[PDB]
Amino acid sequence: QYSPNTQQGRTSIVHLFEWRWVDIALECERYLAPKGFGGVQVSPPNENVAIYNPFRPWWERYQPVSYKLCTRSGNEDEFRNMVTRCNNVGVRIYVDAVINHMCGNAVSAGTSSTCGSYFNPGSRDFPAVPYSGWDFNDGKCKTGSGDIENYNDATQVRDCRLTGLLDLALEKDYVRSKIAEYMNHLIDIGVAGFRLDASKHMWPGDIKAILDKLHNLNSNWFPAGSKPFIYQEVIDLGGEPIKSSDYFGNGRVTEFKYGAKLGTVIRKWNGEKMSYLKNWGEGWGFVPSDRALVFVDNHDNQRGHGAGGASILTFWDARLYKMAVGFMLAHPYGFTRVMSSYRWPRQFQNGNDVNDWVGPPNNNGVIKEVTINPDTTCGNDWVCEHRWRQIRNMVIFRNVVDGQPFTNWYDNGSNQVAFGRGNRGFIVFNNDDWSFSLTLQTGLPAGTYCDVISGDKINGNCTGIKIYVSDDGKAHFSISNSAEDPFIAIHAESKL
Ligand SMILES: [Ca+2]
Ligand SMILES: [Cl-]
Numbered sequence: 485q486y487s488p489n490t491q492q493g494r495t496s497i498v499h500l501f502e503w504r505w506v507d508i509a510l511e512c513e514r515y516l517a518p519k520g521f522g523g524v525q526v527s528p529p530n531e532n533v534a535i536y537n538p539f540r541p542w543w544e545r546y547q548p549v550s551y552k553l554c555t556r557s558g559n560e561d562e563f564r565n566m567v568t569r570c571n572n573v574g575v576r577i578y579v580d581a582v583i584n585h586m587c588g589n590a591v592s593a594g595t596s597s598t599c600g601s602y603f604n605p606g607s608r609d610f611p612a613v614p615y616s617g618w619d620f621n622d623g624k625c626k627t628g629s630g631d632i633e634n635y636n637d638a639t640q641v642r643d644c645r646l647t648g649l650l651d652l653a654l655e656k657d658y659v660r661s662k663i664a665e666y667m668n669h670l671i672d673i674g675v676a677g678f679r680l681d682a683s684k685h686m687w688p689g690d691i692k693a694i695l696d697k698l699h700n701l702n703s704n705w706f707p708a709g710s711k712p713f714i715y716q717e718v719i720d721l722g723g724e725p726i727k728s729s730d731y732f733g734n735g736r737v738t739e740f741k742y743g744a745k746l747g748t749v750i751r752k753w754n755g756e757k758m759s760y761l762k763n764w765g766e767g768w769g770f771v772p773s774d775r776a777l778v779f780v781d782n783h784d785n786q787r788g789h790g791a792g793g794a795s796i797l798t799f800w801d802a803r804l805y806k807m808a809v810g811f812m813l814a815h816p817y818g819f820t821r822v823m824s825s826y827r828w829p830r831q832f833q834n835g836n837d838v839n840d841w842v843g844p845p846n847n848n849g850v851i852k853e854v855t856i857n858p859d860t861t862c863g864n865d866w867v868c869e870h871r872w873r874q875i876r877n878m879v880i881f882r883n884v885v886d887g888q889p890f891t892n893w894y895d896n897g898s899n900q901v902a903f904g905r906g907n908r909g910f911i912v913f914n915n916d917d918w919s920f921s922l923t924l925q926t927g928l929p930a931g932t933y934c935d936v937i938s939g940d941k942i943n944g945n946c947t948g949i950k951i952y953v954s955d956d957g958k959a960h961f962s963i964s965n966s967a968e969d970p971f972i973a974i975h976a977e978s979k980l
Pocket of ligand 1: 584641642643644651652685686
């Protein structure tokens with residue numbers, strides 16, 4: 485469960501948040517495969533409640549109605565088509581698995597669901613699975629409200645309703661079987677793994693129990709005995725009874741301290757500075773590199789939704805964001821996930837975005853197609869951070885240097901730092917209020933290298949900055965504090 489199952493030499497996955505299946509299929513072939521992306525994390529493919537007030541929020545997808553593959557992203561055929569097309573070009577699919585709960589206990593019964601299936605939250609009847617009142621933790625929860633009231637109580641965190649969502653009785657073999665059934669349906673179509681939503685709210689053992697019921701990966705695309713990659717969503721900043729280490733037996737875990745700390749450092753808050761990143765990694769109290777899934781931001785926290793808080797860097801902070809994502813992709817710690825978002829009408833009222841619920845770009849609830857502009861960026865309110873030159877080029881950087889050790893670290897004691905990856909890549913950052921202009925040891929073979937942040941290596945030349953490495957691996961670097969992108973990156977494959 486620890487191996488992502490990506491094609492050799494593909495080191496990252498992209499979250500194509502709320503995208504339609506047909507658009508992901510196209511994206512795999514026209515961009516992901518040619519640009520070296522290892523895989524895609526998709527939004528929950530199972531039927532959810534259609535919430536009309538507010539109007540179709542992104543969060544309605546974390547409120548399952550059934551295990552039917554029918555959502556605003558598309559139907560089963562479309563999902564199967566996408567997995568096929570993606571796998572055939574060597575781009576893997578990771579399904580966001582929503583298995584700790586069903587919908588909010590207070591949603592109205594009926595058929596307001598993405599696939600029209602009937603449901604009755606009130607009576608706990610989910611006839612499309614089916615599930616009944618006997619499959620929930622109602623009798624287990626011991627909180628007054630039936631909801632999680634105390635995060636210092638571990639039992640509570642797992643048997644009570646997270647924000648009122650109907651908590652499934654995961655110790656029951658019937659429940660475990662229904663979920664494994666859904667997951668096995670996905671494995672057979674061709675998925676390579678799963679993001680386990682709200683793992684913190686589930687006992688490690690119950691998760692184990694479900695995993696034991698799973699099939700090996702599709703033998704048409706994976707080697708026999710291949711196990712699905714598992715990464716569990718556990719929010720573990722310090723101090724709670726639940727530790728992320730309690731989930732290592734099941735797979736990797738999301739390292740939420742990563743983006744929270746990186747954000748503080750890049751923003752230069754709390755007396756933090758880039759020179760402190762010399763020992764970034766476990767040295768910072770993070771989980772072992774072999775069990776981490778890292779990222780700058782995720783779908784929840786880029787909304788100010790406190791899974792790292794105010795220090796989280798997002799596409800909204802484009803300059804600092806490219807820097808942070810570049811740092812993450814060059815650094816050997818963990819397995820990296822890149823975020824791809826949609827723009828929404830952010831409207832702050834007393835430090836709160838009143839429109840943090842806004843769903844993907846739509847026309848009366850129908851998700852708008854991902855359009856591609858002449859310059860390769862996207863239209864229709866899709867941000868497509870994965871298509872920003874500085875980001876896609878750093879995805880490539882990570883593939884080129886895979887396996888190379890962290891070396892040739894430099895720092896000015898402030899926010900000007902540089903580091904290499906073996907003899908295959910070198911990166912330099914200027915986050916200080918003055919220019920950087922120094923000759924550094926890069927550990928790279930002599931030559932002219934294209935800077936992949938400002939441009940690209942295209943048919944024997946560079947469209948951006950050219951770096952000259954002398955015979956002794958030294959190269960001069962100049963970076964103005966007012967540069968658009970105050971960082972430079974060169975690698976074995978950007979050399980002319
Ligand atoms: Ca639970
Ligand atoms: Cl996540």
